[PDB]
Design a protein around this nucleic acid. Sequence first.
DNA 1: CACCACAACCGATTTT
DNA 2: GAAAATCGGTTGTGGT
Lengths: 89, 75
Amino acid sequence: AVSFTLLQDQLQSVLDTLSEREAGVVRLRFGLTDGQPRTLDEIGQVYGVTRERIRQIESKTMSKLRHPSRSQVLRDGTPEERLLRAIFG
Amino acid sequence: NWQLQGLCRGMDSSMFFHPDGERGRARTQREQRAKEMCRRCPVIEACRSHALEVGEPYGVWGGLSESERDLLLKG
DNA sequence: CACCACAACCGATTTT
DNA sequence: GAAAATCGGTTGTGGT
Ligand code: SF4
Ligand SMILES: C[As](C)(=O)[O-]
């Protein structure tokens, strides 16, 4: 099963409807940018905010991805599985 | 599984989450539009108990604003 | 229209 | 796992 391509496709897809900042944070946290997860402090540095504000933004984003309005990826080692399991975990 | 029947299944989060910074009249009317959808929604009850069981920090869920839920759970 | 000046307000963000 | 404290952008009013 190489359905991992199309999971990326539709995940790029759902990320594209968060805000810029919400997408950047999920991207930095899971390393969907250069394949290297960043800590909540490194993300704070990027955005000029504290780690605690990063955690609030992350939380909102998790709320948005698990809302019924746009969570059509509940069809089931790697960052994109990390992010998936972090949404339904 | 109960998500598949939500009335908001296609239109995305525009309606149920507030953009950064939204305050005043825009904020309350976004909330109202969302609630008006939920009231018609065949899975409101499963949506509501889900949001309260797990304590969804953001969005309108099950007909409840964020701060309504915050008020129903505290303590 | 612009600018300014504030005050109240309350979401964003920082601090416990 | 937060909750409370404080900051600062916005909104509305009223001026030049
Ligand atoms: S209750 Fe509201 S939010 Fe929950 S599914 Fe129905 S319409 Fe969507
Ligand atoms: C003033 As800042 C954007 O570093 O929180």
